[PDB]
Design a binder for these strands. Structure first.
Lengths: 48, 102, 112, 116, 49, 144
RNA sequence: GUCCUUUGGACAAUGGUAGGAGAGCGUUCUAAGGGCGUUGAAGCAUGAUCGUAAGGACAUGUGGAGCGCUUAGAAGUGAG
RNA sequence: ACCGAUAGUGAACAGUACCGUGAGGGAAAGGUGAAAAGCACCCCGGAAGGGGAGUGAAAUAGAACCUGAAACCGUGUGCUUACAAGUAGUCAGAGCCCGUUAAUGGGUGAUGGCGUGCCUUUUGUAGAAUGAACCGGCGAGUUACGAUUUGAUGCAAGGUU
């Protein structure tokens, strides 16, 4: 119910290994455009 | 080609033209020290000195009388309030071999 | 040649800004601007304004190009913290920290 | 007059923190834990300066014993034979010769052997 | 005698003992008193006689 | 003076063949463990791996003394409640005798990571036939 | 320490809690004498230096006006 | 031979903010520069903030303004790490990277040996007995008057106000 010892820098930064943001897609927009959220309805600088 | 000499309280394997470090000798820098106690001669003809080789001198030239790397001696006892701290540097003499005799 | 920009006292917790700065680091500028428009995070617009300010410095202050530019450095530093309190149940209080950050990027040329 | 507890405290604490350099995590950064590790390691070094002597003697004896079984003899019997021949050479010396010049070591083995 | 170089007679002044100032002095932690009881206490001891 | 060979680094490992027919398990085991360990080389240092490869091929003419066959149970636990298993010496020698020999070699080696590596220089075969002719293996005879 | 005392050749000795005895290291302030400092004081940071210990220097960077040493004296004189 | 901003008055800017029905209790908080010359102007921006340029001996002296330690949080990089069992050090020791108060040089470290923190209290504590989250400051044999016993110094059948 309470932590028995404190958490160290090594252990806390190991736990944060997967606490990441996913890279958004990076596909070329097909009709016209540039790299984007893949297979999107992409309108940002494009016409998907 | 190599010889065994007994100097200080220790024994050292030596060859013509190498540098050695021994316990302090009474000599000054520049001088030539000569070792008596030779135990083994590893040449083309091998001489074994079970006591001594009876002859067998090794010549060397003194250079750099010096005092060694410093170590801190520290000891303590746990729940007793006693600890001791002191420093030590050990003296040495530096030599280069020129002669191995027999 | 390098150019930079800084944003000081951005009232967002640095641990949250750093999570979006890891997507644009070491990328070239157009790539980075495009990435900062598709990720939905509260700090994306602020970071994107600092990147435009840095890009603008590199072509007015040092009068060089803008397509041959790469994000050399991006980091967040801590600012000063504001101290607050919530009231909790048994008539007793607890602390709230309102953390801030300092934002820097540097856009580089790859050369002198 | 009044003294302040000024610049002396940091100097004394900073010596210990520098002397804890290379330790793991808090061990090389925080004074109370660094002080404990730096006094613990000083007591290790005393014990281990004593232990080097016996560790190298153990290694020399085992290498001479390896060299002795090659010439069909045991370490204990060899050293006894050398004592009876009077040979004054040393465990460390006996290993260094047995590694560099096997032909000098073989003559020692024969004299140690017919001394018996 | 000059006023910048002056010394007392040999053996005429000593320094005072200062207890409670670490362990190498010999009378740190308990400061000469031992461990417990009435004579380890501040203002303690007993009346003469 | 430090005049002392230690740096075994860049050693030369060889390849050996011992046969198990009509030997005692423990005595063969201890001599082989010594060879794998490197205790027989005038150049020996405990922190680097000297020592060399040993091939045991008959592993079926192993000899026990006394009533070892029915006694000498082997045990293992699976960390699952009540999960103790067992097998007696004779039927372990009768099915998978290679395990019988290599277990008792590896129990005679240090349990460090270097020691568990030195146990990987061991190859055991039931029957007098092995595949290692490209290594050019030499016969070694138990010098008890 | 010991004693022939050539204080060196030896005869030695040298684990330690309550606790007794001795000798020292640093801090702030005062007197006297000599010093240093915008061509850069104190403080801060780094170094592979010195002393038997507490501790002392010097070089470099930062800092921008004060501060050492020698002999003596007096204490709000040392923290895990 | 008093203190120098946790000191010295509670109070260097207050019997105030605040707390209490009331009697009453009671803080934290000094420092740009010699002189405001306290940043005209352009660029990004809604702004804040920044980049140049300028003033200055000096703007990492820009008002959160003398210096600016540590805990704590980051960015980069030389060596090392995904078969491994641990008070994390010490002694030995390859391989790789360096070059100093140049000296029996520095950084990191495959692999081997040995090794149950500190303080307090106890016959006896790794203890599953106490205490400490970490770092910084502050925090405990003193003075006055008497008495006894040592050391020093002057005079001595006297010595001292």
């Amino acid at each position: 119910a309470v932590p028995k010892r404190r958490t160290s820098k090594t252990r806390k930064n190991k736990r944060r290994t997967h606490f990441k943001i996913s890279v958004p897609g990076m596909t070329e927009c097909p009709n016209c455009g540039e790299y984007k959220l893949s297979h999107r309805v992409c309108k940002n600088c494009g016409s998907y | 080609m190599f010889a065994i000499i007994e100097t200080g309280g220790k024994q050292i394997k030596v060859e013509e033209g190498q540098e050695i470090f021994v316990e302090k000798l009474d000599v000054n820098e520049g001088d030539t020290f000569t070792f008596d106690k030779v135990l083994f001669v590893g040449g083309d003809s091998v001489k074994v000195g079970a006591p001594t080789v009876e002859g067998a001198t090794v010549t060397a030239t003194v250079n750099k009388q010096g005092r060694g790397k410093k170590i801190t001696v520290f000891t303590y006892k746990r729940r007793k309030n006693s600890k001791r701290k002191k420093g030590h540097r050990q003296p040495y003499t530096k030599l280069t071999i020129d002669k191995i005799n027999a | 040649m390098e150019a930079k920009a800084v944003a000081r006292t951005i009232r967002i917790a640095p641990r949250k800004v750093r999570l979006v700065l890891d997507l644009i680091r070491g990328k070239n500028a157009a790539e980075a601007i495009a990435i900062l428009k598709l990720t939905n995070k509260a700090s994306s617009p602020v970071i994107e304004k600092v990147l435009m300010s840095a890009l603008a410095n590199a072509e007015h202050n040092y009068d060089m190009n803008t397509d041959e530019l790469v994000v050399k450095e991006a980091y967040a530093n801590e600012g000063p913290t504001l101290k607050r309190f919530r009231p909790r149940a048994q008539g007793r209080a607890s602390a709230i920290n309102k953390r801030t950050s300092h934002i820097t990027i540097v856009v580089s040329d790859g050369k002198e | 007059p009044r003294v302040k507890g000024g610049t002396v405290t940091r100097a004394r604490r900073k010596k210990t923190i520098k002397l804890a350099k290379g330790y793991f995590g808090s061990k090389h950064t925080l004074y109370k834990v660094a002080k404990q590790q730096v006094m613990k390691s000083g007591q290790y070094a005393f014990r281990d300066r004593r232990q080097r002597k016996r560790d190298f003697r153990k290694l020399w004896i085992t290498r001479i014993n390896a060299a002795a079984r090659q010439h069909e003899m045991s370490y204990s019997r060899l050293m006894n034979g050398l004592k009876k021949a009077g040979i004054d050479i040393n465990r460390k010396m006996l290993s260094e010769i047995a590694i560099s010049d096997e032909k000098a070591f073989a003559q020692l083995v024969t004299k140690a052997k017919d001394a018996l | 005698m000059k006023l910048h170089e002056l010394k007392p007679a040999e053996g005429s002044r000593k320094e005072r003992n200062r207890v409670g100032r670490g362990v190498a002095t010999g009378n740190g932690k308990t400061s000469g008193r031992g461990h417990k009881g009435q004579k380890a206490r501040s203002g303690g001891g007993v009346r003469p006689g | 003076m430090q005049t002392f060979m230690a740096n075994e680094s860049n050693i030369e490992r060889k390849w050996y063949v011992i046969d198990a027919e009509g030997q005692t398990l423990g005595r063969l085991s201890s001599e082989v463990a010594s060879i794998l360990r490197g205790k027989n080389k005038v150049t020996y240092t405990p922190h680097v791996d000297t020592g060399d490869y040993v091939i045991v091929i008959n592993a079926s003419k192993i000899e026990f003394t006394g009533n070892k066959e029915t006694d000498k149970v082997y045990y293992r636990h699976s960390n699952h409640p009540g999960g103790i298993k067992s097998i007696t010496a004779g039927e372990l020698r009768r099915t998978n005798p290679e395990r019988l020999i290599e277990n008792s070699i590896k129990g005679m080696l240090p349990s460090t990571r270097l020691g568990e590596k030195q146990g990987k220089k061991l190859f055991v075969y039931g029957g007098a036939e092995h595949p290692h002719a490209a290594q050019q293996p030499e016969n070694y005879e138990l010098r008890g």
